[PDB]
Design a protein around this ligand. Structure first.
Ligand code: ADP
Ligand code: ADP
Lengths: 31, 54, 375, 52, 54, 31, 375
C-alpha cells in the first residue's frame, strides 16, 4: 500500500508551514 | 497383474497429473503471492522512498 | 478513435518516447527510442522473427538483439529508424494517423538544426501531417508546472540542455549544454559495478544496468556524509535481481552513479555539475531576470526521479546562489512527464492555433522552415 | 485530508483482514493437499503390500 | 507389458512420490510464502497505518 | 509501529511551521 | 642466483606467467599459469606423484593431469593456486625469497578490486614480502614501448583492456574495455578444427590447440581476400604435427581464429571488434588528444604476435581515421613481453620508490591499502 496517507499529510503540513513561512517572510519583510 | 499395474499406473498417473496440476496451481498462487508480496513491499518501499522525506 | 482533429503530442529523445493526444494529461503509451535487430543466425524454420523490432518489441526480444537508439545526445541521426518509431508511436498504439492530425515534437535551442528539420520533414513528407510544431522542452515543462519563468534542468538520457525561460521568453545565450546525461550515468555505474566484480558489456547487459540505476540509485543531499556511512556499512546496501537469478549488491555505488551529476569529472567531463550549470544559466541573465529564475528552478525530464534529486539541487544551488534571496525547486509528481503534458497544453491552446507550420507552408519553403517558424 | 485517514485505515484494515485470512484459509487447503500427498504415500505402500 | 506397466506403475509411484514431495514442497512453499509474505507485507501495511501517521 | 523517517520528518515539516510561525510572530510583533 | 636486493616482477595472467627481477630486460622464465592435479587412479606404488603440480611441472606431467588456471578473464579466484605459482616462480625459478625483496604484480585499472587486493594481501601475509606494488599494465606497456602517449591494446588471454593514455594521464572515459580474448580464440579454433574432422576435448587436447594457434595462426592483411583463396586452395594450408604423430592440416581456419578479434560475433560476442574499439578510444578523446593517439597505437600482451595483426590494426584505423593524420602501429619485438619489461622499468624507477607499499604500512592498514597506494 502506497504511503498516500502522508503524501496527503505532507501536503497539509507543507501548507501549514508554507503559510507560517509566508508569514515569517512577510513579518520580516514588513520591517 | 497387468490390469492392476496398468490400472495402478494410469490411476497413479492421474495422481501424477493431480499432484502436478496442484503444484502448478500452487505455483500460480505462490507467484501471485510473490507478486502481491513484491507489489506491496515495493509499493511501500517506493512510497516510503518518496515519503522518507516527510 | 478521435472525435476532433486534435494534435498528437510526443516527447521523443535519446532515451524514451512518450506519446498521446493533445488535451490529455498523460501520454497514452511510452516506448524506449529503440530499434532492435537480431545478432544471430536463425536455426529453426517457420519461427516468425522480425527483421527489426520497434520500441517495446525491441526490449521484449532483446536476448538475441542488438539494440540501437536512432537519437543520440539529443539528435536524430537515423531517420529510417525514426520513421518506424513514429509509426509505432502515433499509430500502432494511439490508432491515430498523423495525416489528419497536427503533430508537436520537442528539443532545445542548442540542439543542432538537423534535429528540428528531420522531425518536421519526416512528419510532413512520410506521414503527411497537416501541420507541425517543434517546442522547447523547457517551455512545455513550465506550462505543465504552472510557470512562465524558471530554469528547466532536463537532465535526460543523452544530453542536459538546461534552458532558462523568463516570462515566456527564451534566454538562449544562457543555455548551458552539458555532455552528461543518464546514458553516461549508466556507463559510470557499469564501470563501478565492474570494480565490485560485475562486468556489463553487451546490449542486454547495458539495458540491465539502466534498470539497476532507475530502481536502486539515489542522489541524497550530502554525498560526503552519505559515502562516509555507505562505504563503512552494509546497512546502506541494496540487492538487485539480474534476470538470470544472480544478485548484484550495490553500496556507495548506489549514489556514486547519480553523483556524477554533481561530479561530471567522473566521466571525463570538464564540468562541476548540473547545479553549476543551473547557477550559470541564471548568472548569465540580467539580475532582474535572475531573482525569478533562482526562485523557480524547475526539474523536468529524466533523472528527476532519483530520490533526493529535487532537494539536493535546491541545496546545491542555494550554496552557489547569493544569500537573502529565496532559492526554490519546482518538482511535482508530473516530473519527467511535464514535457509531454506541456506539449498537450500548448498544442491545444486557442492562441497556439496560429503557431502551427502548415503543410502548405512546409511544401513551399522546404525542411528548413522549422528554423523560421518554431523559435 | 479525510482521504489520508480513509487510506491509512483502508490500506491497513482491508488488507490485514483479507490477507491474513487468505494466509490461514489457504494454509488449511495446503495442509489438506499435503494430507493428500500422505494418502498417496499410503496408497503406494498399500499397493506394494497387497502385491507382496 | 507388466514390467512396462509396472515400470509405469512404479514410474507413477515414483513420479507421484516426486510430486508428493513437490506438492508438499509447494504446499510448504506456498504456505511459507503466504505466511511470510502476506504476514510481513500486510504487516508492513499495518505498519503503514502507523508509519504514515504523524 | 511508526516509521522514524516519517515521524521525524513530519515533525520537521510541523517544525518548519512552528518555527516559521514563531519567527512570524516575533518578527511581526516588532515589524 | 641474482646479485642484488632488487624488486621482483611477475606478470601472472590467465594464460601464462612471466617472471624475473626488476632491472633486467626480460623475465628469467615464462611458465603456464597452471596448477595440475591427477585425473587417474594410481596402480603402482613408490612412484612419487604429487597432489598438485605447478607451472612447468603441471605441463610436463599433463598426460595424467587435469589442468586449471587461477585467473578468470583477468580476475584471481583461486588464490591458493596463485600461491603455488608465486611460490614456485619466486622460490625455485627466480631463486629468491620474497621476504627479502619488494614484489610487483600486474592488472588492468578496470579489473575488479578483489584481484589487486588479493595480490597485495597474499604477498604480504603468506610470503611476508617487505613491499608491494600492483601495477597498471597499460603503464608498463608504454614504458617498454618508449611512449607516454598512445592506446594500449594488451589483447591478452583474459581481457582486451584498450586504454588511451596522454602525456602520462589516463583518459578513462574512453577505455573501450572488451570481453574478447586469446582464451576464447583457442576455444573457437577447437570448434572449427572439429568442423574439419579433428575433435579436441580434454586438457591435453586444449594445450595442443593452443600450441597450434601460437605457431600457425595469423590475421592477414585482408580477411575477405585471404579466405577467398584459403578456403578454395591448398596453397594457403599449413600442417601441424600433433604429439602422437598425427597430422592436422588447417586452411582458412588458420586465420578465422585471429579474425574473431576483428569479428567477435564468431564467438557470440556483441562487439565492434578490437580495431573499432581502438578507434573509438581515440575518437572519444578531445580534438587536441586524438592526433597523438592516432600516431600511437601501442601493443602489449599475446595475440599481438599473430602475423599481420600489427598491419591489419594500422589499416583498420587509417581507414576510419581522418586524412592529414599519420596513423601508426607500435608493435616492437618486446611483443607479449611489453608488460613484464615495463614492470622492471617501473619497479626500478627512482621516481617510483615512494610508491611501494611497505609491510609495516600494510599491516597497519589491511588489504584495502592497495587502493590507497597503487590504484
Ligand atoms: N528513477 C529514475 N532514475 C534515474 N533515471 C531516470 C529515472 N526515471 C527516468 N530517468 C531517465 O529518463 C531518461 C529519458 O528522459 P527525457 O528527459 O524524457 O529525454 P528527453 O526529454 O530529452 O526527450 C532515461 O535515460 C531514464 O534513465
Ligand atoms: N605466437 C603467438 N601468437 C599469438 N599469441 C601468442 C603467441 N605466443 C604467445 N601468445 C599468447 O600470449 C598470452 C600470454 O601473454 P601475456 O598477455 O603477456 O600475459 P598477461 O595477460 O598477464 O599480460 C597467451 O594468451 C598466449 O596464447
Amino acid at each position: 500500500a502506497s504511503m498516500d496517507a502522508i503524501k496527503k499529510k505532507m501536503q497539509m503540513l507543507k501548507l501549514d508551514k508554507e503559510n507560517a513561512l509566508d508569514r515569517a517572510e512577510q513579518a520580516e519583510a514588513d520591517k | 497383474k497387468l490390469k492392476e499395474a496398468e490400472t495402478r499406473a494410469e490411476f497413479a498417473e492421474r495422481s501424477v497429473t493431480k499432484l502436478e496440476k496442484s503444484i502448478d496451481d500452487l505455483e500460480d498462487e505462490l507467484y501471485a503471492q510473490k507478486l502481491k508480496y513484491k507489489a506491496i513491499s515495493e509499493e511501500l518501499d517506493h512510497a516510503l522512498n518518496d515519503m522518507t522525506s516527510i | 478513435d478521435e472525435d476532433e482533429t486534435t494534435a498528437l503530442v510526443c516527447d521523443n529523445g535519446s532515451g524514451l518516447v512518450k506519446a498521446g493526444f493533445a488535451g490529455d494529461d498523460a501520454p497514452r503509451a511510452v516506448f524506449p527510442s529503440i530499434v532492435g535487430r537480431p545478432r544471430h543466425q536463425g536455426v529453426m524454420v517457420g519461427m516468425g522473427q522480425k527483421d527489426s523490432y520497434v520500441g517495446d518489441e525491441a526490449q521484449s526480444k532483446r536476448g538475441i538483439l542488438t539494440l540501437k537508439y536512432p537519437i543520440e545526445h539529443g539528435i536524430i541521426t537515423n531517420w529510417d529508424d525514426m520513421e518506424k518509431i513514429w509509426h509505432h508511436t502515433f499509430y500502432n498504439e494511439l490508432r491515430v494517423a498523423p495525416e489528419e492530425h497536427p503533430t508537436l515534437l520537442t528539443e532545445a535551442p542548442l540542439n543542432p538544426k538537423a534535429n528540428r528539420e528531420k522531425m518536421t520533414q519526416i512528419m510532413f513528407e512520410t506521414f503527411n501531417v497537416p501541420a507541425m510544431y517543434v517546442a522547447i522542452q523547457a517551455v512545455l515543462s513550465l506550462y505543465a508546472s504552472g510557470r512562465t519563468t524558471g530554469i528547466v534542468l532536463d537532465s535526460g538520457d543523452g544530453v542536459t540542455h538546461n534552458v532558462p525561460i523568463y516570462e515566456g521568453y527564451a534566454l538562449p545565450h544562457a543555455i548551458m549544454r552539458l555532455d552528461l546525461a543518464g546514458r553516461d550515468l549508466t556507463d559510470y555505474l557499469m564501470k563501478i559495478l565492474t570494480e565490485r566484480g560485475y562486468s556489463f558489456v553487451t546490449t542486454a547487459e547495458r539495458e540491465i544496468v539502466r534498470d539497476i540505476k532507475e530502481k536502486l540509485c539515489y542522489v541524497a543531499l550530502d554525498f560526503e556524509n552519505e559515502m562516509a556511512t555507505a562505504a563503512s556499512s552494509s546497512s546502506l546496501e541494496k540487492s538487485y535481481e539480474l534476470p538470470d537469478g544472480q544478485v548484484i549488491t550495490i553500496g556507495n555505488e548506489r549514489f556514486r552513479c547519480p553523483e556524477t551529476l554533481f561530479q561530471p569529472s567522473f566521466i571525463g567531463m570538464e564540468s562541476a555539475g548540473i547545479h553549476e550549470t543551473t547557477y550559470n544559466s541564471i548568472m548569465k541573465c540580467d539580475i532582474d531576470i535572475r531573482k525569478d529564475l533562482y526562485a523557480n528552478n524547475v526539474m523536468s525530464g529524466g533523472t528527476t526521479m532519483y530520490p533526493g534529486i529535487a532537494d539536493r539541487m535546491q541545496k546545491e544551488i542555494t550554496a552557489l546562489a547569493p544569500s537573502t534571496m529565496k532559492i526554490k525547486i519546482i518538482a511535482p509528481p508530473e516530473r519527467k512527464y511535464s514535457v509531454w503534458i506541456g506539449g498537450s497544453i500548448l498544442a491545444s491552446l486557442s492562441t497556439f492555433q496560429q503557431m502551427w507550420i502548415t503543410k502548405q507552408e512546409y511544401d513551399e519553403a522546404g525542411p528548413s522552415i522549422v528554423h523560421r517558424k518554431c523559435f | 485530508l479525510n482521504e489520508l485517514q480513509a487510506l491509512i485505515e483502508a490500506h491497513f484494515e482491508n488488507r490485514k483482514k483479507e490477507e491474513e485470512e487468505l494466509v490461514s484459509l489457504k494454509d488449511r487447503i495446503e495442509r489438506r493437499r499435503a494430507e493428500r500427498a500422505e494418502q498417496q504415500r499410503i496408497r503406494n505402500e498399500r499397493e506394494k503390500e497387497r502385491q507382496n
